[PDB]
Amino acid sequence: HWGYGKHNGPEHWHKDFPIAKGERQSPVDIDTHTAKYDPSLKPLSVSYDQATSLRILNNGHAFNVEFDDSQDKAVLKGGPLDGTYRLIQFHFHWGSLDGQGSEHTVDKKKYAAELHLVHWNTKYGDFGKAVQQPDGLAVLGIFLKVGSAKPGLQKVVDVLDSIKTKGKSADFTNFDPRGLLPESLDYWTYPGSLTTPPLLECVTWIVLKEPISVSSEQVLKFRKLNFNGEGEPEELMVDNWRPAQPLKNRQIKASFK
Numbered sequence: 001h002w003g004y005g006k007h008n009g010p011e012h013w014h015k016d017f018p019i020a021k022g023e024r025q026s027p028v029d030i031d032t033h034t035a036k037y038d039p040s041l042k043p044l045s046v047s048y049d050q051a052t053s054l055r056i057l058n059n060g061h062a063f064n065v066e067f068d069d070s071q072d073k074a075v076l077k078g079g080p081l082d083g084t085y086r087l088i089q090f091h092f093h094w095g096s097l098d099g100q101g102s103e104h105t106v107d108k109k110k111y112a113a114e115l116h117l118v119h120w121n122t123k124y125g126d127f128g129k130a131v132q133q134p135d136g137l138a139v140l141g142i143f144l145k146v147g148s149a150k151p152g153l154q155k156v157v158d159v160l161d162s163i164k165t166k167g168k169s170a171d172f173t174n175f176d177p178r179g180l181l182p183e184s185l186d187y188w189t190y191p192g193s194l195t196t197p198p199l200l201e202c203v204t205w206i207v208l209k210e211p212i213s214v215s216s217e218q219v220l221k222f223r224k225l226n227f228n229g230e231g232e233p234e235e236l237m238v239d240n241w242r243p244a245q246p247l248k249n250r251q252i253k254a255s256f257k
Ligand SMILES: Nc1ccc(/N=N/c2ccc(S(N)(=O)=O)cc2)cc1
Pocket: 116, 118, 131, 139, 193, 194, 195, 196, 197, 198
């Protein structure tokens, strides 16, 4: 029954998930001055031309846009990655107010929200086997700030009314995640974890430096979602972010000078 509240939120997770206090937990604060440019990083390749979305789901902690990952399509490679990683889902974390909501921070700055595009390493055959591996996953993280609308986000916004409550899902085909990407692929990268239980330490994080802008109206619609199920007392789905965790024995690398 983990969640984001007082009695079940991030400070409680370690009881059921002791890895919460592990050596490579996420998210982290990205100290931009300490991050070092890495000339060993290969160009990052985001190839989403053939991405095939299937469905959108309110899982009671966020909403997931799911992809058919049965064929080699929507792939992430290059950068810090060895081999090819396949897109399985994306989701967001966001705040109750524009001043908070991101999981990663940049010199302690919190963005209004953060998009996570989740990929599994194809060497491991599927997502379930990949999460048993230290290099099983790559998550592409993208910050959201409130300003101009993101036109490519609107289709997601408009379907949220149909998945208000935990356990609701809806068909969501033909969504193009290319419409969610900023111009620049400049990034920071480090080894980390899932940011929700089970908090598994499988993730190569790739966090883009350039945020996307979304409108106040768009993020307000995220905030109308519910953590609770249909017929249950309303608890708005807001502040579904884990705070920054200790960096410990890690270096953050920059893809740019
Ligand atoms: N058994 C199991 C259950 C839930 C799992 N969740 N997958 C996740 C995928 C991505 C993230 S995140 N917020 O992108 O780090 C967090 C969790 C993964 C494995």
